Amino acid sequence: PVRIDNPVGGFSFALPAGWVESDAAHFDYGSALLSKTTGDPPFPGQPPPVANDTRIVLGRLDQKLYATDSKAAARLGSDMGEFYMPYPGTRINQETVSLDANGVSGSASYYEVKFSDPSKPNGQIWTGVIGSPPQRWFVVWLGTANNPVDKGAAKALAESIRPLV
Amino acid sequence: PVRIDNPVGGFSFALPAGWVESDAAHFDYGSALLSKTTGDPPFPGQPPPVANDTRIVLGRLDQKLYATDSKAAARLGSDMGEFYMPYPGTRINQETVSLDANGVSGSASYYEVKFSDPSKPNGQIWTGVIGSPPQRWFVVWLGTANNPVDKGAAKALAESIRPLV
Amino acid sequence: PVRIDNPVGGFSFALPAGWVESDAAHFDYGSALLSKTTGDPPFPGQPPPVANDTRIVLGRLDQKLYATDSKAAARLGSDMGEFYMPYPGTRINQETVSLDANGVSGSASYYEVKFSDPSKPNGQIWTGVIGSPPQRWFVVWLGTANNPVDKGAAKALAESIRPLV
Amino acid sequence: PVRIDNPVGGFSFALPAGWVESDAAHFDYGSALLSKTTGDPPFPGQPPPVANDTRIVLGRLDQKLYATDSKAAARLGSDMGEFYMPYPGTRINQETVSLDANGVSGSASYYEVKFSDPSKPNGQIWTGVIGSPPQRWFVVWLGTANNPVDKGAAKALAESIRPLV
Amino acid sequence: PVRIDNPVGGFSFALPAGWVESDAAHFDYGSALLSKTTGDPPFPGQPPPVANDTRIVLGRLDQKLYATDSKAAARLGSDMGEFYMPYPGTRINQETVSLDANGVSGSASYYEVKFSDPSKPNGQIWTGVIGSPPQRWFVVWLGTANNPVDKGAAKALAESIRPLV
Amino acid sequence: PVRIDNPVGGFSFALPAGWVESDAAHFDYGSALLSKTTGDPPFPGQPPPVANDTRIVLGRLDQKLYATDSKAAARLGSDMGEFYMPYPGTRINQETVSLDANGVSGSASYYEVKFSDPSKPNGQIWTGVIGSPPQRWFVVWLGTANNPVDKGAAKALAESIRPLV
């Protein structure tokens, strides 16, 4: 269990096994970007290869944005799907998941996308919003048929968030 | 008239007055990103402030992607609107524009977006696809009510593209 | 109250409300650069727009540099004004401010600059030096007539510094 | 045929089909780094995924370094193998190749490495040195059993180099 | 003679022997930053070590900034000295130099700085402004007692500037 | 005593006096790169000049890589010497050093390299591997005749590593 503090965003989280941070400037403004390592370990001290088709972004969800956590996660999930999967397609295999992060509750919206382009692998996106009983945080786990969202690990990641105090 | 070569993308273009390049790594793979300067000139040698709500991206449009140039620009324009304006809204003031870049023809799709969020300024996007009589290039000019797309300048930019030979 | 640790510089500080970190390489050598967010929140996970004409830099003040804290802040303030406002002008509205950071005392030097160029907004700079009773830290808050130095917040920032132990 | 100028290094070359530039700071000092695209095209304007286990570096070969071109390429090839494949192994399938770039001649040294680690794919490296009849340039193409050196394309790349005049 | 084009700035120049480019983002907005190599050549493909106390910056000099070229170079030289040598000192060994870049004339202002700090090496700065008979370009060569401005090479650099047409 | 946490790598260490961090992306994947400051302090807030010929890299040593700690450090030291000192030479002045980091033991391998090139300064490399009684970390301190490895400080750095819990 590797715990990571995000001081600007006011939270800590547990890094999922198999993932590293990428693009550390995210922390400057209270977010974090994670990538999934692939292949054999790199030379010591050098960055590991990471997958191209999956990513996790998490962070503080601005108070002015999105308004229950169920509605907020569904709305944020739709917006994230446009932002990261802009191509035409159809949503399938949708789910909503209740989140309970040590008392701070939330909700997540998951769906898969069958694209119009027959050559494109299906997309997958899990978007969670979790709050204290009013600071809020989001978790977005993006994947594909080839690197699927690990839904259990996405819930565990969101439920690992703790406010820094 | 400032002409800029993009060797990896196989084209040159005329830089619009008032714009500079940003994020030069775009050229590594045959694209270019431009930003609009704002304010007074910076100290000599230092980067100019640029606007936050408008941008131009242009580049070679991969042969496997998008299939007339009219259809290609409409499809690329829809995808670019999702990618850059992911929030819910309605398209208004749509236009299609014929392009003729020194014999190489093309088409552009323009639309404005009235967002559901009453506090968000309307979005604007112009997407052009232009080809030789089969290399193709795209031009996307993104703006808002506060920094509108200059449609004449967007057409001039797309019609300024020339293949490098 | 968001507290940020700067391990290389040996201090923590309270992030001012409305500010984020920029250019995280500053922390590699014991300094921090902050920028002021502007506009509506960005898309979640993306960096916020920041103001162009105001900035905060803080850090450990090297033992070989600058020698009371009153003299040190005045000298550092003059040097910072040259470095960040190199253009000809006149200092006006000067002030010196006593600092007391939980027992560790210091001083700050503030001044405004009326530039010779009538089209340039006046500049403003607040420079504080604070020490333990001999590690020392500096705080420089730069602004303009359009984004003024918040002198109360600058004093609060300097008086929020605590040594890491 | 996409020709790329490297002004600091004083040469141009033909970009191999299927490759893009990476890490453009190389050009600041007269070198170039290329990476091999993988997968489907990225969203227009965005960087393509590239392979992790193959790369090309080329550039001006400093006059003080390495001294026929046959000896120079063999020595540079040994050094490049240490730098990029530092792990213990055995060289196999060695070859030397004569180069003739429009009158400017040179030589290349190729070898494969069977590593001691049974789980590591074999390494492959092609190192060419080519000169005018005394400016010199190098080309290093690194690969593995999974992404082999394309020896014909490596020779074509080195023989595509032309001095800028 | 290595000629470098700066398309956004609308000029080309001759790279001084012994110098490389640094921080290529300068070209995005029409400027260039050069650094002086030190030591033995680096491993091929890797960046050369450069000196820490000398630099050249050149670029298009915005039409709204600075107004003969004699006055412009003196004013820009004073501002550049504040920006790059902010510490208290005295100017000594001042010179003004006429520039003639293939018909486009200009002027440069040089001075050395004896700092108040006895441990600081003297600073040196050469600032040139050159124009067509109304586009203008600047050249600033910064050095110290340990890496002096090469005044002949600075004049040659400014007189090497040619408009791109 | 400045202690630095590396959350992704699961350890903290004591920063050696005279060293700063460089290239902070190392922390994204559980490693750290340190550089040695040179010269007078930089302007406050600006990065210090660092030496070109010495560096420290440390990090978590992947469980699949390298298998006692004596053998692991010798093997990693050979690989690091190829990676960082690829040129032909002879090892001299070899040493092995036992490490005891607050109960977690390890070993280091040191050697100097006399290069074939008479103009190249001798190289020096110290490579340590230290473990809990099975997480492991490495420390590599690279130097030259002109900036030698400080062997006492390298041992102190490795023996300063503590797991984060």
Chain-centroid distance, C-alpha C37: 16
Phi, psi angles (nearest 5°) of residue E108: -130, 150
- Cα separation, E154 vs E126, whole angstroms: 7
- Cα separation, F12 vs F102, whole angstroms: 13
Phi, psi angles (nearest 5°) of residue C112: -110, 155
- Cα separation, C58 vs C10, whole angstroms: 12
Between positions 136 and 165 of D, the ones with CB within 8 A of E are 138, 140
Local structure of residue E94 (DSSP, 8 states): E
- The answer to whether the CB of C82 falls within 8 A of the CB of C115 is no
- The answer to whether the CB of D107 falls within 8 A of the CB of D70 is yes
- Cα separation, F31 vs E32, whole angstroms: 33
- Cα separation, A36 vs A19, whole angstroms: 4
Cβ burial E115-136 (10 Å sphere, 16+ → b, else e): eeeeebbbbbbbbbbbbbeeeb
- Cα separation, A85 vs F92, whole angstroms: 57
Residues of chain C found within 8 Å of residue A57, distances taken between Cβ atoms: 44-45
- Cα separation, C79 vs C67, whole angstroms: 15
Pick from F92, F33, D65, F80: which is nearest to E39 by CA? D65
Q: Is F83 on the interface with D (CB under 8 A)?
A: yes
Q: Which residue of D has its CA nearest to B66?
A: D44
Alpha carbon dihedral C51, C53, C55, C61, in 10-degree steps, equals 160
Residues of chain C found within 8 Å of residue F40, distances taken between Cβ atoms: 64
Q: Cα angle at E18 between E15 and E23, to 5 degrees?
A: 65
Tokens of E46: 């890797």
Tokens of C83: 């470095």
Q: Cα angle at D88 between D83 and D89, to 5 degrees?
A: 105
Size of chain E in residues: 165
> CB within 8 A of B165, min separation 6: which ones?
none
Tokens of A23: 């693009």
Give the H or E element holding residue E4: strand E3-6
Phi, psi angles (nearest 5°) of residue D4: -120, 125
Q: Can you tell me which residue has the tokens 């977006």?
A: B113
Domain ranges for chain C: 1-165
Residues of chain A found within 8 Å of residue F137, distances taken between Cβ atoms: none
- Cα separation, D29 vs E22, whole angstroms: 8
**Residue of C8, C10, C65 lying closest to F44 (CB–CB):** C65
Tokens of F43: 């302007």
* Cα torsion C40, C46, C51, C56: sign: positive
Rg of chain B on CA atoms, in Å? 16
Instruction: Return the bridge partners of D124, or none.
Output: D112, D143
* Cα torsion A90, A93, A96, A99: sign: negative
SS3 per residue for E57-83: EEEECCCCCCCCHHHHHHHHHHHHHHH
Local structure of residue E155 (DSSP, 8 states): H
Give the H or E element holding residue C60: strand C55-60
- The answer to whether the CB of E142 falls within 8 A of the CB of E55 is yes
Name the experimental technique. X-ray
Q: Which residue of B has its CA nearest to C50?
A: B52
- Cα separation, A66 vs A74, whole angstroms: 10
> CB within 8 A of B152, min separation 6: which ones?
none
Instruction: Return the bridge partners of A142, or none.
Output: A55, A125
Amino acid (1-letter code) at residue E103: G
SS3 per residue for chain F: CCEEEECCCCEEEECCCCEEEECHHHHHHCEEEEEEECCCCCCCCCCCCECCCCEEEEEECCCCCCCCHHHHHHHHHHHHHHHHCCCCEEEEEEEEEEEEECCEEEEEEEEEEEECCCCCCCEEEEEEEEECCCCEEEEEEEEECCCCCCHHHHHHHHHCCEECC
**Residue of A23, A24, A44 lying closest to F138 (CB–CB):** A44
- Cα separation, D153 vs D138, whole angstroms: 15
Local structure of residue E25 (DSSP, 8 states): G
- Cα separation, C7 vs C10, whole angstroms: 5
Q: C with D: 3 or more CB pairs under 8 Å?
A: no
- Cα separation, D159 vs D43, whole angstroms: 33
> CB within 8 A of F78, min separation 6: which ones?
D88, F109
Local structure of residue E37 (DSSP, 8 states): B
Instruction: Return the bridge partners of F48, or none.
Output: none
Tokens of E48: 């050369």
Phi, psi angles (nearest 5°) of residue E26: -55, -40
Pick from E80, E49, E54: which is nearest to E142 by CA? E54
- The answer to whether the CB of A74 falls within 8 A of the CB of A96 is yes
Q: Can you tell me which residue has the tokens 């074509």?
A: D156
Cβ pair F40:E119 closer than 8 A = yes
Local structure of residue B25 (DSSP, 8 states): G
Cβ neighbour number for residue E84 with a 10 Å cutoff:
18
Cβ burial A12-21 (10 Å sphere, 16+ → b, else e): bbbbbeebbb
- D157: Cα within 13 Å, side-chain hemisphere: 29
What CA–CA distances, in Å, run from B70 to A86, B66, B127, B128, D86?
19, 11, 10, 9, 53
Mutation site, D36, D52, D144, interface A, largest A CB count within 10 A: D52
Pick from A23, A83, F15: which is nearest to C164 by CA? F15
The resolution in Å comes to 1.5
Instruction: Return the bridge partners of B143, or none.
Output: B124
Give the H or E element holding residue D81: helix D69-84
Local structure of residue E49 (DSSP, 8 states): P
What CA–CA distances, in Å, run from A49 to A41, A84, A121, B125, D52?
8, 21, 21, 35, 7
Q: What is the side-by-side order of every strand in the sheet holding D104-115?
A: D19-22, D31-36, D55-60, D136-144, D123-131, D104-115, D89-101
- Cα separation, F71 vs B32, whole angstroms: 50
- Cα separation, E109 vs E107, whole angstroms: 7
Instruction: Return the bridge partners of D110, or none.
Output: D95, D126
Cβ burial A122-139 (10 Å sphere, 16+ → b, else e): bbbbbbbbbbbeeebbbb
Phi, psi angles (nearest 5°) of residue A121: -60, 150
**Residue of E82, E87, E88 lying closest to C86 (CB–CB):** E82
Cβ neighbour number for residue A27 with a 10 Å cutoff:
21
Tokens of F61: 């040593």
DSSP labels, C73-140: HHHHHHHHHHHH--S-EEEEEEEEEEEEETTEEEEEEEEEEEESSTTSPPEEEEEEEEE----EEEEE
Pick from E97, E111, E100: which is nearest to E142 by CA? E111
Amino acid (1-letter code) at residue C45: G
User: What is the widest separation between alpha-carbon atoms in chain C?
Assistant: 49
> CB within 8 A of C165, min separation 6: which ones?
none
Local structure of residue C28 (DSSP, 8 states): G
Strand intervals (E) in E102-164: 104-115, 123-131, 136-144, 162-163
SS3 per residue for chain A: CCEEEECCCCEEEECCCCEEEECHHHHHHCEEEEEEECCCCCCCCCCCCECCCCEEEEEECCCCCCCCHHHHHHHHHHHHHHHHCCCCEEEEEEEEEEEEECCEEEEEEEEEEEECCCCCCCEEEEEEEEECCCCEEEEEEEEECCCCCCHHHHHHHHHCCEECC
- D22: Cα within 13 Å, side-chain hemisphere: 16
- F47: Cα within 13 Å, side-chain hemisphere: 16
Cβ pair F31:A44 closer than 8 A = yes
Q: Is E89 on the interface with D (CB under 8 A)?
A: no
Cβ neighbour number for residue E72 with a 10 Å cutoff:
23
Q: Is A28 on the interface with D (CB under 8 A)?
A: no
Breaks (C-N over 2.5 A) in chain D follow: 66, 133
- D41: Cα within 13 Å, side-chain hemisphere: 15
Cβ neighbour number for residue C86 with a 10 Å cutoff:
18
> CB within 8 A of F58, min separation 6: which ones?
A45, F13, F31, F32, F34, F137, F138, F139, F140, F157, F158, F161
Q: Cα angle at B126 between B123 and B132, to 5 degrees?
A: 165
- Cα separation, B162 vs B5, whole angstroms: 9
> CB within 8 A of E24, min separation 6: which ones?
B24, D24, D25, D27, D28
- Cα separation, D50 vs F112, whole angstroms: 37
DSSP labels, B44-93: TTSPPPB-SS-EEEEEE--TT----HHHHHHHHHHHHHHHH--S-EEEEE
Residues of chain A found within 8 Å of residue F8, distances taken between Cβ atoms: 2, 4, 15, 20-21
Tokens of F128: 């340590």
SS3 per residue for B91-104: EEEEEEEEEEECCE
- The answer to whether the CB of A61 falls within 8 A of the CB of A75 is no
Residue C90: which region, alpha, beta or left (left: phi > 0; alpha: psi -120 to 50)? beta
Pick from A47, A3, A55, A57: which is nearest to A25 by CA? A57
Cβ pair E62:B41 closer than 8 A = yes
Neighbours of chain B (3+ CB pairs under 8 A): A, C, D, E
Tokens of E142: 């910064």
> CB within 8 A of E1, min separation 6: which ones?
E14
Chain-centroid distance, C-alpha F115: 21
- Cα separation, E25 vs E4, whole angstroms: 15
Cβ neighbour number for residue F74 with a 10 Å cutoff:
20
- Burial bucket for residue A118 (CB in 10 Å: 0-12, 13-18, 19+): exposed
Indicate the SS3 state at residue E100: strand
Q: Which residue of E has its CA nearest to B27?
A: E28
- Cα separation, F84 vs A45, whole angstroms: 12
- Cα separation, A26 vs A2, whole angstroms: 19
Q: Cα angle at C80 between C77 and C83, to 5 degrees?
A: 155
Tokens of E107: 């002027």
Instruction: Return the bridge partners of D50, or none.
Output: D37
- The answer to whether the CB of D95 falls within 8 A of the CB of D114 is no
- Burial bucket for residue E36 (CB in 10 Å: 0-12, 13-18, 19+): buried
Q: What is the side-by-side order of every strand in the sheet holding A31-36?
A: A19-22, A31-36, A55-60, A136-144, A123-131, A104-115, A89-101
- Burial bucket for residue E29 (CB in 10 Å: 0-12, 13-18, 19+): buried
Pick from C66, C69, C50: which is nearest to C131 by CA? C69
Instruction: Return the bridge partners of E33, or none.
Output: E22, E57
- F142: Cα within 13 Å, side-chain hemisphere: 21
> CB within 8 A of C22, min separation 6: which ones?
A28, C33, C34, C35, C50, C55
Pick from B83, A60, A131: which is nearest to C48 by CA? A60
Amino acid (1-letter code) at residue E133: P
Q: What is the side-by-side order of every strand in the sheet holding B11-14?
A: B3-6, B11-14, B162-163
Tell me the nearest-neighbour CA distance from D139 into chain B, angstroms.
Answer: 18
* Cα torsion A115, A120, A121, A125: sign: negative
- The answer to whether the CB of F31 falls within 8 A of the CB of F4 is no
- The answer to whether the CB of E139 falls within 8 A of the CB of E157 is yes
- Cα separation, A44 vs D55, whole angstroms: 19
SS3 per residue for D94-155: EEEEEEEECCEEEEEEEEEEEECCCCCCCEEEEEEEEECCCCEEEEEEEEECCCCCCHHHHH
Neighbours of chain F (3+ CB pairs under 8 A): A, C, D, E
> CB within 8 A of F121, min separation 6: which ones?
F53, F144, F145, F146
